[PDB]
Amino acid sequence: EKYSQKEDKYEEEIKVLSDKLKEAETRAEFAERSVTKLEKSIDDLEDELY
Amino acid sequence: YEEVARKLVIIESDLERAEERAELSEGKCAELEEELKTVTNNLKSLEAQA
């Protein structure tokens, strides 16, 4: 029973980590689009500046 | 003869009791072998489950 509950606690740690990972990865990939958008805008602004 | 005949009955009755205790302690030991195998198999089930 404590190991069934740990099966659930560990499964919950996987579920929470899966949700936190989906947020960290979605935020990382979105923020990486903000990286690429800021970077592209910086290159375009540099082409304009040039 | 009467002392050993009445004590023969006591000793036959104590053989019936010594044998009854052989049967009762053996019968209970065998019940405990079954209880033990049941809790050992339940323990192995719970241990396998755990």
mmCIF file of C-alpha atoms in Angstrom:
data_model
loop_
_atom_site.group_PDB
_atom_site.id
_atom_site.type_symbol
_atom_site.label_atom_id
_atom_site.label_comp_id
_atom_site.label_asym_id
_atom_site.label_seq_id
_atom_site.Cartn_x
_atom_site.Cartn_y
_atom_site.Cartn_z
ATOM 1 C CA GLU A 1 0.000 0.000 0.000
ATOM 2 C CA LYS A 2 2.722 2.638 0.740
ATOM 3 C CA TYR A 3 4.403 1.462 -2.496
ATOM 4 C CA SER A 4 1.011 1.733 -4.349
ATOM 5 C CA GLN A 5 0.850 5.250 -2.883
ATOM 6 C CA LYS A 6 4.488 5.766 -3.941
ATOM 7 C CA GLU A 7 3.499 4.303 -7.353
ATOM 8 C CA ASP A 8 0.970 7.215 -7.377
ATOM 9 C CA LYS A 9 3.416 9.788 -5.724
ATOM 10 C CA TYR A 10 6.124 8.897 -8.261
ATOM 11 C CA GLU A 11 3.500 8.771 -11.062
ATOM 12 C CA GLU A 12 2.353 12.200 -9.822
ATOM 13 C CA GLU A 13 6.019 13.379 -9.810
ATOM 14 C CA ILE A 14 6.144 12.141 -13.463
ATOM 15 C CA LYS A 15 2.815 13.875 -14.206
ATOM 16 C CA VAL A 16 3.907 17.128 -12.495
ATOM 17 C CA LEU A 17 7.350 16.920 -14.164
ATOM 18 C CA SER A 18 5.615 16.163 -17.509
ATOM 19 C CA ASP A 19 3.428 19.289 -17.022
ATOM 20 C CA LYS A 20 6.447 21.350 -15.744
ATOM 21 C CA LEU A 21 8.576 20.003 -18.619
ATOM 22 C CA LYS A 22 5.787 20.809 -21.114
ATOM 23 C CA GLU A 23 5.745 24.322 -19.656
ATOM 24 C CA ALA A 24 9.594 24.581 -19.523
ATOM 25 C CA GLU A 25 9.948 23.183 -23.086
ATOM 26 C CA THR A 26 6.934 25.184 -24.440
ATOM 27 C CA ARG A 27 8.268 28.314 -22.686
ATOM 28 C CA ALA A 28 11.836 27.480 -23.896
ATOM 29 C CA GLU A 29 10.678 26.886 -27.513
ATOM 30 C CA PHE A 30 8.356 29.944 -27.401
ATOM 31 C CA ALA A 31 11.121 32.008 -25.747
ATOM 32 C CA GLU A 32 13.472 30.597 -28.443
ATOM 33 C CA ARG A 33 10.974 32.025 -30.952
ATOM 34 C CA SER A 34 11.306 35.307 -29.012
ATOM 35 C CA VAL A 35 15.134 34.738 -29.290
ATOM 36 C CA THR A 36 14.825 34.185 -33.082
ATOM 37 C CA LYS A 37 12.341 37.071 -33.471
ATOM 38 C CA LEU A 38 14.492 39.468 -31.417
ATOM 39 C CA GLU A 39 17.623 38.153 -33.221
ATOM 40 C CA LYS A 40 15.978 38.446 -36.666
ATOM 41 C CA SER A 41 14.712 41.938 -35.763
ATOM 42 C CA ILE A 42 18.290 42.772 -34.587
ATOM 43 C CA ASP A 43 19.710 41.532 -37.956
ATOM 44 C CA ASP A 44 16.959 43.456 -39.875
ATOM 45 C CA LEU A 45 17.642 46.576 -37.721
ATOM 46 C CA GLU A 46 21.392 46.079 -38.380
ATOM 47 C CA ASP A 47 20.682 45.782 -42.180
ATOM 48 C CA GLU A 48 18.623 49.021 -41.808
ATOM 49 C CA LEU A 49 21.386 50.524 -39.605
ATOM 50 C CA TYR A 50 23.972 49.501 -42.206
ATOM 51 C CA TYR B 1 -1.634 -54.978 39.650
ATOM 52 C CA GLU B 2 -4.531 -52.618 40.514
ATOM 53 C CA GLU B 3 -2.110 -49.691 41.060
ATOM 54 C CA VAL B 4 -0.511 -50.428 37.637
ATOM 55 C CA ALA B 5 -3.927 -51.330 36.060
ATOM 56 C CA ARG B 6 -5.523 -48.053 37.134
ATOM 57 C CA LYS B 7 -2.217 -46.321 36.288
ATOM 58 C CA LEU B 8 -2.261 -48.352 33.051
ATOM 59 C CA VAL B 9 -5.624 -46.680 32.414
ATOM 60 C CA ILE B 10 -4.027 -43.324 33.470
ATOM 61 C CA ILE B 11 -1.017 -44.122 31.194
ATOM 62 C CA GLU B 12 -3.298 -45.360 28.325
ATOM 63 C CA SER B 13 -5.356 -42.175 28.879
ATOM 64 C CA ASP B 14 -2.002 -40.260 29.001
ATOM 65 C CA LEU B 15 -0.944 -42.199 25.868
ATOM 66 C CA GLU B 16 -4.286 -41.170 24.308
ATOM 67 C CA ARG B 17 -3.500 -37.662 25.574
ATOM 68 C CA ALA B 18 0.243 -37.877 24.560
ATOM 69 C CA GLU B 19 -0.913 -39.154 21.149
ATOM 70 C CA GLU B 20 -3.778 -36.567 21.164
ATOM 71 C CA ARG B 21 -1.082 -33.971 21.899
ATOM 72 C CA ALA B 22 1.049 -35.553 19.124
ATOM 73 C CA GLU B 23 -2.075 -35.247 16.847
ATOM 74 C CA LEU B 24 -3.083 -31.799 18.254
ATOM 75 C CA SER B 25 0.450 -30.351 18.123
ATOM 76 C CA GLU B 26 1.005 -32.075 14.719
ATOM 77 C CA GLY B 27 -2.512 -31.023 13.615
ATOM 78 C CA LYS B 28 -1.929 -27.474 14.819
ATOM 79 C CA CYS B 29 1.662 -27.518 13.342
ATOM 80 C CA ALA B 30 0.090 -28.643 10.015
ATOM 81 C CA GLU B 31 -2.605 -25.907 10.383
ATOM 82 C CA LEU B 32 0.305 -23.519 11.033
ATOM 83 C CA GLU B 33 2.106 -24.936 7.930
ATOM 84 C CA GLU B 34 -1.046 -24.054 5.976
ATOM 85 C CA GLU B 35 -1.380 -20.641 7.789
ATOM 86 C CA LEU B 36 2.384 -20.114 7.256
ATOM 87 C CA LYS B 37 2.201 -21.097 3.562
ATOM 88 C CA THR B 38 -0.890 -18.835 3.257
ATOM 89 C CA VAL B 39 0.893 -15.841 4.904
ATOM 90 C CA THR B 40 4.172 -16.731 3.081
ATOM 91 C CA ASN B 41 2.237 -16.805 -0.235
ATOM 92 C CA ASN B 42 0.396 -13.592 0.777
ATOM 93 C CA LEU B 43 3.805 -12.155 1.807
ATOM 94 C CA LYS B 44 5.254 -13.268 -1.559
ATOM 95 C CA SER B 45 2.172 -11.731 -3.266
ATOM 96 C CA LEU B 46 2.566 -8.475 -1.225
ATOM 97 C CA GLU B 47 6.366 -8.558 -1.650
ATOM 98 C CA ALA B 48 5.898 -9.204 -5.386
ATOM 99 C CA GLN B 49 3.273 -6.419 -5.373
ATOM 100 C CA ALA B 50 5.510 -4.071 -3.272
#
